[PDB]
Design a protein around this ligand. Structure first.
Ligand SMILES: O[C@@H]1[C@@H](O)[C@H](O)OC[C@H]1O
Ligand SMILES: O[C@@H]1[C@@H](O)[C@H](O)OC[C@H]1O
Ligand SMILES: O[C@@H]1[C@@H](O)[C@H](O)OC[C@H]1O
Ligand SMILES: O[C@@H]1[C@@H](O)[C@H](O)OC[C@H]1O
Ligand SMILES: O[C@@H]1[C@@H](O)[C@H](O)OC[C@H]1O
Ligand SMILES: O[C@@H]1[C@@H](O)[C@H](O)OC[C@H]1O
Ligand SMILES: O[C@@H]1[C@@H](O)[C@H](O)OC[C@H]1O
Ligand SMILES: O[C@@H]1[C@@H](O)[C@H](O)OC[C@H]1O
Ligand SMILES: [Ca+2]
Ligand SMILES: [Ca+2]
Ligand SMILES: [Ca+2]
Ligand SMILES: [Zn+2]
Ligand SMILES: [Zn+2]
Ligand SMILES: [Zn+2]
Ligand SMILES: [Zn+2]
Length: 316
């Protein structure tokens, strides 16, 4: 809509206050004109028609329970935009400042959130398995990173390529969570998963085995469920990424940690320059090594640590 750029205030799913960029024309709309071609957040009104109505509010105050998923979808889309622009010089998910559109209150009791090829879609959860999923910045950034992948390498969504696709989204979801630096960790979805249970998450990058996911290539899932285990086998790559950043000794292999920023630069360059739709784990290792070589030199600690981490998870 056409209007004046304003700044509202509200509370997110977890009860935290934040400012949101809005547009004023009779109503205040969740339309952020400060980022690219805009960030737009919509009310799906418990239906499955998309996108729904551009979110309209009478007073630019967003403290109602019903407002909270929209506040967070809108704000965390902005954080994700800021991460990719400030850290990687990437303008929105397509690198050409595409508008970021999000719909909340999608369906009823819907325990999922997804990038659908042109927008984000957030269920409210059933209140037991999940609370509204836009409350998780790593979920928001994980899903927006699928769009980044779609517009670059084009990794399919099955078998090893699909597990890489998933891991890339977990890696940058986590790096966005650290970039926002409110309550970061190496877990996925902890803020919105199982409100009755503290200390759990959907999966752990630091210790995938905590939830039964593999932390070594020899433990990879080879069945047909989950498109060949894309959310399971991602643990092998997630563990490698965790090791590259934080270091550690894993199955007897010592990894010197190089920190989060270099992890992100290495994997971002691998994704955008070297991966292809059918890249497998071994080809991801090669891409990460070449990326670290480009950025830091063949004799660098960064290259050596990439090799150590992939050795530690059994990917040659
Ligand atoms: O409403 C306006 C928006 O549509 C435009 O894109 O940039 C400025 C805004 O105030
Ligand atoms: O506690 C939260 C509240 O602060 C917000 O206003 O609406 C959603 C709730 O989860
Ligand atoms: O924590 C990371 C920070 O150290 C780096 O500068 O950019 C990415 C962030 O996630
Ligand atoms: O998961 C924890 C991780 O976040 C931290 O980096 O090191 C200790 C781990 O237990
Ligand atoms: O020890 C873990 C176990 O607690 C869990 O039930 O399944 C995976 C294992 O890694
Ligand atoms: O063969 C692998 C071994 O090299 C490593 O130490 O731990 C897992 C095994 O599968
Ligand atoms: O069965 C597949 C296996 O061969 C591969 O290594 O990892 C993904 C699985 O789907
Ligand atoms: O196969 C790819 C190779 O061509 C390149 O050099 O680095 C990435 C690899 O995965
Ligand atoms: Ca209001
Ligand atoms: Ca997390
Ligand atoms: Ca929980
Ligand atoms: Zn998803
Ligand atoms: Zn995913
Ligand atoms: Zn967290
Ligand atoms: Zn998924």
């Amino acid at each position: 809509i056409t209007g004046t750029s304003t700044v509202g205030v509200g509370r997110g799913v977890l009860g935290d206050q934040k400012n949101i960029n809005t547009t004023y024309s009779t109503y205040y709309y969740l339309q952020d004109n400060t980022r690219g071609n805009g960030i737009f957040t919509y009310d799906a009104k418990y239906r499955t028609t998309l996108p729904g109505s551009l979110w309209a509010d009478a007073d630019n105050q967003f403290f109602a329970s019903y407002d909270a998923p929209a506040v967070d979808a809108h704000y965390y889309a902005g954080v994700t935009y800021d991460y990719y622009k400030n850290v990687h010089n990437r303008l929105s998910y397509d690198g050409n400042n595409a508008a970021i559109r999000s719909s909340v209150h999608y369906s009823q009791g819907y325990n999922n959130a997804f990038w659908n090829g042109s927008q984000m879609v957030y269920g409210d959860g059933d209140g037991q398995t999940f609370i509204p999923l836009s409350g998780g910045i790593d979920v928001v950034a994980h899903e927006l990173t699928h769009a980044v992948t779609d517009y670059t390498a084009g990794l399919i969504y099955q078998n090893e390529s699909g597990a890489i696709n998933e891991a890339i989204s977990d890696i940058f979801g986590t790096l966005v969570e650290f970039y926002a630096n409110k309550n970061p960790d190496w877990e996925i979805g902890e803020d919105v998963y199982t409100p009755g249970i503290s200390g759990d998450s959907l999966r752990s990058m630091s210790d995938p085995a905590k939830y039964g996911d593999p932390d070594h290539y020899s433990k990879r899932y080879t069945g047909t469920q989950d498109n060949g285990g894309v959310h399971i086998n991602s643990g092998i790559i997630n563990k490698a990424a965790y090791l590259i950043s934080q270091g550690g000794t894993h199955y007897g292999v010592s990894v010197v940690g190089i920190g989060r920023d270099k992890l992100g630069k290495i994997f971002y360059r691998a994704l955008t320059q070297y991966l292809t739709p059918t890249s497998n784990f071994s080809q991801l290792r090669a891409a990460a090594v070449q990326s670290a070589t480009d950025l830091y030199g063949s004799t660098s600690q960064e290259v050596a640590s990439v090799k150590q981490a992939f050795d530690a998870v059994g990917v040659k």
